[PDB]
Design a protein around this ligand. Sequence first.
Ligand SMILES: [Cl-]
Ligand SMILES: [Cl-]
Ligand SMILES: [Cl-]
Ligand SMILES: [Cl-]
Ligand SMILES: [Cl-]
Ligand SMILES: [Mg+2]
Ligand SMILES: [Mg+2]
Ligand SMILES: [Mg+2]
Ligand SMILES: [Mg+2]
Ligand SMILES: [Mg+2]
Ligand SMILES: [Mg+2]
Ligand SMILES: [Mg+2]
Ligand SMILES: [Mg+2]
Ligand SMILES: [Mg+2]
Ligand SMILES: [Mg+2]
Ligand SMILES: [Mg+2]
Ligand SMILES: [Mg+2]
Ligand SMILES: [Mg+2]
Ligand SMILES: [Mg+2]
Ligand SMILES: [Mg+2]
Ligand SMILES: [Mg+2]
Ligand SMILES: [Mg+2]
Ligand SMILES: [Mg+2]
Ligand SMILES: [Mg+2]
Ligand SMILES: [Mg+2]
Ligand SMILES: [Mg+2]
Ligand SMILES: [Mg+2]
Ligand SMILES: [Mg+2]
Ligand SMILES: [Mg+2]
Ligand SMILES: [Mg+2]
Ligand SMILES: [Mg+2]
Ligand SMILES: [Mg+2]
Ligand SMILES: [Mg+2]
Ligand SMILES: [Mg+2]
Ligand SMILES: [Mg+2]
Ligand SMILES: [Mg+2]
Ligand SMILES: [Mg+2]
Ligand SMILES: [Mg+2]
Ligand SMILES: [Mg+2]
Ligand SMILES: [Mg+2]
Ligand SMILES: [Mg+2]
Ligand SMILES: [Mg+2]
Ligand SMILES: [Mg+2]
Ligand SMILES: [Mg+2]
Ligand SMILES: [Mg+2]
Ligand SMILES: [Mg+2]
Ligand SMILES: [Zn+2]
Lengths: 119, 149, 84, 124, 50
Amino acid sequence: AGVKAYELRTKSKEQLASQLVDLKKELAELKVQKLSRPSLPKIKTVRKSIACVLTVINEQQREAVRQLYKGKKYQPKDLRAKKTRALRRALTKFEASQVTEKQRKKQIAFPQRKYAIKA
Amino acid sequence: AISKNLPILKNHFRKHWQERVKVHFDQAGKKVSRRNARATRAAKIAPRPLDLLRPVVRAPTVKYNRKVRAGRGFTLAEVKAAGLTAAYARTIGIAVDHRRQNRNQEIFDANVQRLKEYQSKIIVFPRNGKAPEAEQVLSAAATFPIAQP
Amino acid sequence: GKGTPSFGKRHNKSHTLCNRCGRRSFHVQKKTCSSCGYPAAKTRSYNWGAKAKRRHTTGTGRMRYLKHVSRRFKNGFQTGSASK
Amino acid sequence: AKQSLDVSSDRRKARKAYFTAPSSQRRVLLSAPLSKELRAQYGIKALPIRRDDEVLVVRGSKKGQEGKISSVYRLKFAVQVDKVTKEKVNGASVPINLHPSKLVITKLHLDKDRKALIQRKGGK
Amino acid sequence: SSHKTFRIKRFLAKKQKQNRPIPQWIRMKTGNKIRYNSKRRHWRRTKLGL
RNA sequence: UUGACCUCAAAUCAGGUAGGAGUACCCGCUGAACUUAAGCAUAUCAAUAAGCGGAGGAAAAGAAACCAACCGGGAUUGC
RNA sequence: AUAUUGGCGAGAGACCGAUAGCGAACAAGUACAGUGAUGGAAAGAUGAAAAGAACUUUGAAAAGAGAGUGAAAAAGUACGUGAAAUUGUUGAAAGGGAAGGGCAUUUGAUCAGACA
RNA sequence: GUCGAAUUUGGGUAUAGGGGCGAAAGACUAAUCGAACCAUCUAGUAGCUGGUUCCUGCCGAAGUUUCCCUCAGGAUAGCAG
RNA sequence: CGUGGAGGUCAGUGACGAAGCCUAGACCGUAAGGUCGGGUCGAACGGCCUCUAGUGCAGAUCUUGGUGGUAGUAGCAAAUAUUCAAAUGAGAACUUUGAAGACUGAAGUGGGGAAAGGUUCCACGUCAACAGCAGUUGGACGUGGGUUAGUCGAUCCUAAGA
RNA sequence: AAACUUUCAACAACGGAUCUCUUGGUUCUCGCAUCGAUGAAGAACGCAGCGAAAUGCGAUACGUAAUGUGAAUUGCAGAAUUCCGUGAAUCAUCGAAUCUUUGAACGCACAUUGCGCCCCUUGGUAUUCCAGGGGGCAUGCCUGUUUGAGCGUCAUU
Ligand SMILES: [Cl-]
Ligand SMILES: [Cl-]
Ligand SMILES: [Cl-]
Ligand SMILES: [Cl-]
Ligand SMILES: [Cl-]
Ligand SMILES: [Mg+2]
Ligand SMILES: [Mg+2]
Ligand SMILES: [Mg+2]
Ligand SMILES: [Mg+2]
Ligand SMILES: [Mg+2]
Ligand SMILES: [Mg+2]
Ligand SMILES: [Mg+2]
Ligand SMILES: [Mg+2]
Ligand SMILES: [Mg+2]
Ligand SMILES: [Mg+2]
Ligand SMILES: [Mg+2]
Ligand SMILES: [Mg+2]
Ligand SMILES: [Mg+2]
Ligand SMILES: [Mg+2]
Ligand SMILES: [Mg+2]
Ligand SMILES: [Mg+2]
Ligand SMILES: [Mg+2]
Ligand SMILES: [Mg+2]
Ligand SMILES: [Mg+2]
Ligand SMILES: [Mg+2]
Ligand SMILES: [Mg+2]
Ligand SMILES: [Mg+2]
Ligand SMILES: [Mg+2]
Ligand SMILES: [Mg+2]
Ligand SMILES: [Mg+2]
Ligand SMILES: [Mg+2]
Ligand SMILES: [Mg+2]
Ligand SMILES: [Mg+2]
Ligand SMILES: [Mg+2]
Ligand SMILES: [Mg+2]
Ligand SMILES: [Mg+2]
Ligand SMILES: [Mg+2]
Ligand SMILES: [Mg+2]
Ligand SMILES: [Mg+2]
Ligand SMILES: [Mg+2]
Ligand SMILES: [Mg+2]
Ligand SMILES: [Mg+2]
Ligand SMILES: [Mg+2]
Ligand SMILES: [Mg+2]
Ligand SMILES: [Mg+2]
Ligand SMILES: [Mg+2]
Ligand SMILES: [Zn+2]
């Protein structure tokens, strides 16, 4: 058994919140029954369903915030790209390709040429 | 530790020499790497000859002054006598050395002749981008060998 | 009386558990660990102690984050998600 | 002979890869050849073994016996046949582990994925 | 002693739970070479040394 | 009174940045003795071990206040 | 173009073969020792497959004697092969304060070679 | 022996290795003290002691000369292959 | 002469039994050694021409491991001391109950704690190992149960000092 | 003459040599350049139907989401509809998340699971007391903003 992530993505936050509470109630009563029975493997599928519901709720809330900060130059650090510490401090593509006006004139005037030794 | 009629030896092994022993096990491997690097550079760069034209100079010292060899680059006066500028010469595959001077007319004439022959045996493609395909000669030094006068 | 009779008076700990490395090496009165050097900012280590470095170096633990760096580098630090 | 630098002939490496292969890769390793009737009918030589496949034993002391695959024991590199078992002294019966390379498939269990695999291998 | 810090008591709790024999059903697993718990402890033989 | 300038402070002010780890190889500082001299102090071991500071995929060096005395050579690195 | 006993990914050897090779082929920087800095092991192999011995009998029981499984229990979870020191049983021989050895032959036991 | 004091003692705290502490014995400083313990330099050097693994065949010594802080060691000549 | 590994060769040997091991059985060599039969055993191994070395042990108060004589020997003698019966059990000098004789004699062999130990506390089940005899008993083995604070401490204060 | 002692053989002991085996070690060569305040390396404590360790993981706890493969997992139990399919799996891949207490470790402390302050919100007849939930408060330095200090100093009243 267990819930399906793609099915949970088609409902509002209110429905997800209510379904989370019901799963928690079902988990609580199964723990009571575990004390009297030699085994109860059904408790596993309930725990995974709670994890799946929490995952879908988090991805909906995080997606909403990305729309709020869309286009702005400052965004929360958890919504920024991870990469590495050294990669985030490196010069951007625009900064690394900057040249002075003096050097730009030289590059246009005398670029590397294409030639061959035939005749 | 001195006995018998033997030469005096001067083997310098009183330091921790075993920590600094370099055995060239990769001699064959490095040759493969160098050949791969030359092959990939020739394909990558251009149909260009993979090396720059060099002038002929006189070796210094009384022991070696009887022979001529390849120098670093053509002088500013040599390239000027050939009808081109130093900046343009570098982009066509001519090495230019600004710190070498000309005092020998024979050497100056020989280097001018080399520049003349080089310009007549190359094709400079236009900057438009047509670039007709041409056969790539991998060695400009082999095309223009240096001969003892 | 310096042997067996003296051994009966040992009931006061000189070291307790260290909060940084977990060993029973935190000197009570000196307020410093004899193994990792806590609370000093750097971790205590010495080149003459080759074995000591091996016991605590990188790779002896879980490597919770450093495990996945090689995989992320191999894919070029991708962003987004896989396409269906 | 070997002609690629990406493949190794080291015996030690080959044995470690076999014994530590994950479950998905053991499926390919547990392949069985088809019968003459099925080889002509489909046009392929061998396929990975699948549950609910009819097989015939062609090697060992159980040669000549048939049955259906009831379990593919990937962890043990073996399969089990429903009616090929051994009777213990106490009266209980245990399955006999067989290697798929010593079997011959006489009937294939077919679904959407199996049919696509057959056509992918050039079969009909 | 009766007076003990929380850290010591938490440390003692884990050592109690780790002091148990291996379950029998584990020895029946495929490719199992473990027979007895080699890290068993008795309070009078080996001291924790905390 | 008012308004500048200079210098110097404060703020949970706006946005950033440094620490620790690893350290085979790399750039510096600091720095022994056993040992050899058939003793031993200069010397040697050695501008080494240990100790301390700082980087990268390489580092460092690098387009001559160079080498030369030749009919002169021509950034640096390595064999 | 040079360096690289670290990290990641590969290909190899006239290298070692469980007292060897890294300390570690195994729940090894583990068990354990030290107040502490530190110190630091031992330990791989039933069989193709547990088919890991139902059942009967003796004993309080462990187990034994049968039966059975297996190509083989001279493979029984003290498990491949199973050497020596050392030990039990059986058989033969000698022995008045050591034993063992060399040359020669008697006695006992045991044995190859040609029957041309 | 001493037993109301220069008394006995728990815990807290201070002093760390050519340093500490000492009503002073070179005593004590975790069974370690006329200079603790741990790792490294380090496989430190030794003219000195011990050991140095198969067979057969042929040849076969020296303890003497000169020099040496040389006298349990070397160089040198001799004897040997 | 022998040992580990390498090139070549003998279209060499082998599950109809390779290697190893045991064998007062046989044969060859002055010797280092080589060959064969029998037993045990189960998967690889040898002759010859050459190459190579981490290549041959009785010793080093040698290293690691294993095992002897000594030897059923030294010994299991401080702290006054045990005895009868019943119950249980395969089994009782040592367990339980009852009876008797004794000791600690309030600076105790009594009743609580600090430090230190860490589940040794309690019940049930159980005896291969451990309790230098024994064991049905146990601080042993197996499975469970158990530590309840506005007032008791920590927490707060300051001491030498850090 | 026995016992006893010694030597040899067979069978049985003790012990683990020898032979064969090898998912390990060692050395050489080739390619690549990627840790951390966006909280690293390391440490502590927890998480499975039945688990002590190892391995994996973090109260979403031997895992969640996504993608691929296309029917297992396996010691037992269980679940079965998951089987011509948005779908089995201790599978592979991995770009989205979770990530307890810590640690350069950052409100102050730490041999204490000790003690404060600020903002929003909820309950207790409450801006002040008590409690629950969420979000914050380290240091050096750089650029900028704002609020200031000094007869250091200018001009004007
Ligand atoms: Cl307690
Ligand atoms: Cl390893
Ligand atoms: Cl120690
Ligand atoms: Cl100190
Ligand atoms: Cl011989
Ligand atoms: Mg002392
Ligand atoms: Mg103290
Ligand atoms: Mg250091
Ligand atoms: Mg116990
Ligand atoms: Mg004790
Ligand atoms: Mg701010
Ligand atoms: Mg340097
Ligand atoms: Mg000297
Ligand atoms: Mg000397
Ligand atoms: Mg001296
Ligand atoms: Mg150094
Ligand atoms: Mg880097
Ligand atoms: Mg480079
Ligand atoms: Mg640079
Ligand atoms: Mg210049
Ligand atoms: Mg130069
Ligand atoms: Mg080893
Ligand atoms: Mg056999
Ligand atoms: Mg055996
Ligand atoms: Mg024997
Ligand atoms: Mg004196
Ligand atoms: Mg001592
Ligand atoms: Mg030596
Ligand atoms: Mg002679
Ligand atoms: Mg002598
Ligand atoms: Mg044989
Ligand atoms: Mg014999
Ligand atoms: Mg076999
Ligand atoms: Mg040797
Ligand atoms: Mg010998
Ligand atoms: Mg020996
Ligand atoms: Mg000898
Ligand atoms: Mg000895
Ligand atoms: Mg006696
Ligand atoms: Mg006595
Ligand atoms: Mg007594
Ligand atoms: Mg009395
Ligand atoms: Mg009395
Ligand atoms: Mg009790
Ligand atoms: Mg006893
Ligand atoms: Mg007993
Ligand atoms: Zn520490």
